[PDB]
Amino acid sequence: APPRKVLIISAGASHSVALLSGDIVCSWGRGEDGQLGHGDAEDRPSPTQLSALDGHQIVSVTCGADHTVAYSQSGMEVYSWGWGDFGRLGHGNSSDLFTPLPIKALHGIRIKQIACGDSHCLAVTMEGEVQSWGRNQNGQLGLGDTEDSLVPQKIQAFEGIRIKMVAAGAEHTAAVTEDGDLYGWGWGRYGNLGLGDRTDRLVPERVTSTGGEKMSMVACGWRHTISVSYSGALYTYGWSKYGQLGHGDLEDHLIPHKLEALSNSFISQISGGWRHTMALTSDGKLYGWGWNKFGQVGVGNNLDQCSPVQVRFPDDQKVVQVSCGWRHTLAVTERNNVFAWGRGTNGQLGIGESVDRNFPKIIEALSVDGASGQ
Amino acid sequence: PPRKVLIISAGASHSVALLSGDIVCSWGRGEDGQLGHGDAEDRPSPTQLSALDGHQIVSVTCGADHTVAYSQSGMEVYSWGWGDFGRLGHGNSSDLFTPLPIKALHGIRIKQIACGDSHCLAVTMEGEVQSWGRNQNGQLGLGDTEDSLVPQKIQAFEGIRIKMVAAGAEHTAAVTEDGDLYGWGWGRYGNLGLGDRTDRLVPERVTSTGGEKMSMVACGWRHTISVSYSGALYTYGWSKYGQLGHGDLEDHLIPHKLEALSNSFISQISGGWRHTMALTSDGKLYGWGWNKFGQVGVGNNLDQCSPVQVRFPDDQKVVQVSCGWRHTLAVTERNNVFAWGRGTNGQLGIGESVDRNFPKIIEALSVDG
Incomplete structure (x- = not known):
């Protein structure tokens, strides 16, 4: 049997989201703030389909610390859900959302990319303009002041750029x-x-x-x-x-x-975690470094690494995607396998009930292969 | 004989109690070290915090994801948990999974300690105030916005x-x-x-x-x-x-x-993330605010915009209350300790359990069943 292609993976602080082929979004990990979008507030230790978005033709997903965002090109809609404080969801209020709601202010806009921080978000348009929303106490919205914004606003500093x-x-x-x-x-x-x-x-x-x-x-x-x-x-x-x-x-x-x-080496993808880092080379070699208390670095121990170390995968299969969370890491390989490692207490590794893991462990639910080295 | 619970304090997702016989117990979320047991695991049941055995602790106070305690005889204040922005006060940002003395407060006569999310304050017996931790919005009261990794005196209160x-x-x-x-x-x-x-x-x-x-x-x-x-x-x-x-x-x-x-005459107050508790002079506890997880404790899951009395078996009088982010703790005149609200991190201390929308007794700490 064949699984769906994992088109995109994104790690949050304690959750994990993936867009699969067949217009299917799945989410797992910490659910307490509504970041999984399943309506309830429970953690999910296994990849769980996000019905609310079924048939919405989602093209990408991006996690913030404790919220998630996704958008559809065909629908011309950006959706957001999860922890709502400071307006990080961009709905003009601070309400949490335990199910996806469209960001009205972005309806009809051609989205090129979306980035999510802890409490603020930004969207880049096909024309290359940027809109930002959420916490702004330190100017992170780039709007020239320090007032939070509950709705997207254009970064006028970038006009003509x-x-x-x-x-x-x-x-x-x-x-x-x-x-x-x-x-x-x-x-x-x-x-x-x-x-x-x-x-x-x-x-x-x-x-x-x-x-x-x-x-x-x-x-x-x-x-x-x-x-x-x-x-x-x-x-x-x-x-x-x-x-x-x-x-x-x-x-x-x-x-x-x-x-x-x-x-x-030529670096083709990068990701920053809470206290760790990943970099992926053009030959598909993954390197990790930083804080490793929970094994999020993926090198087989629990000692911090201040220099890059290659994260190893069965048969040295090449990595094509990597995303860092706060205490975990996710990766997709050339063989259509998904791996996770690090902290597993909120179910964020997506492998059913599990201890923490200090090297890559396959997510059988989303992968072609089964467990190796057994 | 069950040791008397002297002080209870709720953090965001954790719970800490000081018991008679000079022992501290902690339970709930453990991922940031806020329980002080050396590991990073949640505890569904009240767990004795061994590092503080025999340290003559007189009070405990929880922040969101950290804990503070102090001793009068030892003239020492201790802190542990999430270390970012200097909220633990040790001159660095390191998390701590076991309590350590706040050296800056060694030998200071402490009247009270308060902990927020990312900053803390201590009042001395003389009525001076020292603050430390995050300061991005002036919350340390020092006249600037630079985080402080060690306690500093609030000079604005000189003479007050x-x-x-x-x-x-x-x-x-x-x-x-x-x-x-x-x-x-x-x-x-x-x-x-x-x-x-x-x-x-x-x-x-x-x-x-x-x-x-x-x-x-x-x-x-x-x-x-x-x-x-x-x-x-x-x-x-x-x-x-x-x-x-x-x-x-x-x-x-x-x-x-x-x-x-x-x-009513209010004797004690506690603010949670999005809810509130007030205790009257005659032991009636009232709750209000956000109730999604049952943290208001009125036996339901609907928000409460006016005070509603939190009912206990036989209207036994409540003597103490402390609000977490999604849970609440209380102690009653019968030396029972109740907990309600969110239970997923083990914060209710009643063993593996779902959320509760009315007070549930903590058998490990309570006289009644």
Whole structure:
């Protein structure tokens, strides 16, 4: 028998969401805040179909810490659900949602990408404009003030600049332009904006330290940031209390700092977790580093890693997708297998009742293969 | 003989009690170390916190995802749990899975400790106040917005003896020995009581108190509760879930007397995430606000915008109450300890259990079955 293709995986703080072929969205892990979208508030230790979105032709899903977002191109609709405080759902109120509701303000808009932080969200349009909503106490919305926004608003600072992709951490935000410029704004106290100081910004400010390179992508962890250049070089900045910047030490960096141990690899995907980091090379090799108390790094132990270590998979099958949560990691491989590792107490690994795992464990429910090495 | 429960405190998803015989017990969510047992696992039943055996603890106080306790004889304050923004006070941001002394407070005579989400405060016997932790909205009251990893004195209170303090998500309140009421920190929902929605970086005196002196204050997540010298209860700040208890859902920017309780004398108050509890001088406990998980304890799952009495078997008098984010704890005159509301992290302490919408006895700590 054949499973559905996993088109997209996204990890939240304690939950996990996936879009499968056949217009099917499934969610598992912590459900207490309505982030799973199954109507109730219970955790689900196994991938569970999100009926509410059946036949809504969803094209992508993105998790925030304790909420989830999804959008449909054909429907021209963005849906949101979960913890609602500070307007992170963008419905013009602070109500939690335990089932998906469309973001009226985004109806009819052509969405290119969506990013979710802890308490704020951003959407990039096909034209390259950006709209943001949610908590704004430190300027993370990039609107020039510090007032929360319960509805999406355009970032006027970016007019005339085509944005390629955006990313969001706990309370900071980053972006890269089509022509390769890197921006940061929001809470900046650990150097995570990349601007060379520890001060907040209320509008996007361009990062002028990029190793002389244009930047193709950016990702945010909780209080650290990661970017990849046009040459596939990897840069990290912000907090490194747990070694999550990956430079072989525990020092913060206030400007982008090239990760020299990966200088001979081309990075194709990046993801930032609460206190850990993942980077995926063009040859499908996954590297992880940072906090590993619960084994979220995936290297077979529970010791923190301040330098990149290759995460190994059965038969060295290549990885094609990776997403970091707060205490867990998810990955999709070339064989249409899904793996999870790290903390399992909210069911976020999706493998039925389970202890925590410190190396990749297959999610049989979503995978072609069965358990290996048995 | 069941040890008497002396003090109960509820965190966001955890529960902590001080028992006679100098032992601390903790249960509920354990993932951030807030239980203090060294591991990171939830405990469905009250579990003795061995590291504090024989430390002569006199009080415990829960923040959202951390816990504080102090000893008079040892002149020591301890903290453990989620460490971010310096909420534990040890000069760093490290989580702690077992209690450690807050060195900065070593030898200080402690009158009271309050814990919010990400910041804490200690009042000294002399009425001075020290604060530490997150400060992005001025909640430490130090006149800036820089987080502090160690306790710092609130100089704004020099010459003003503080009686008691309280801490919400990112706001703080206090009452003075003379009965003046103060507010500071994040103020966006009117929860400072100052008549507006602006933050304050230093304490500001509440000037509209119905011409009354205040003896107590407590903070919920984004609301604030105070009690006057005449036992009158006032609430202010957020009432989206009816947590202010006035019968409507409008926010109040200044303290507002809860008229339904005007004939009662309130002896104890507690603010939860989105609900509230008030205990009368004659042992009647009233709850109100958000009730999705049954945390109001009225035997149902509907929100309650006016105070409703929490019923116990035979109307046995309640002597103590403490609100969590989705649960509530109480102790009664019969030395029973009840818990209700959300149970998924084990916070009710009744062993593996679903949620409860009316008080359930904690057999491990209680006389009655």
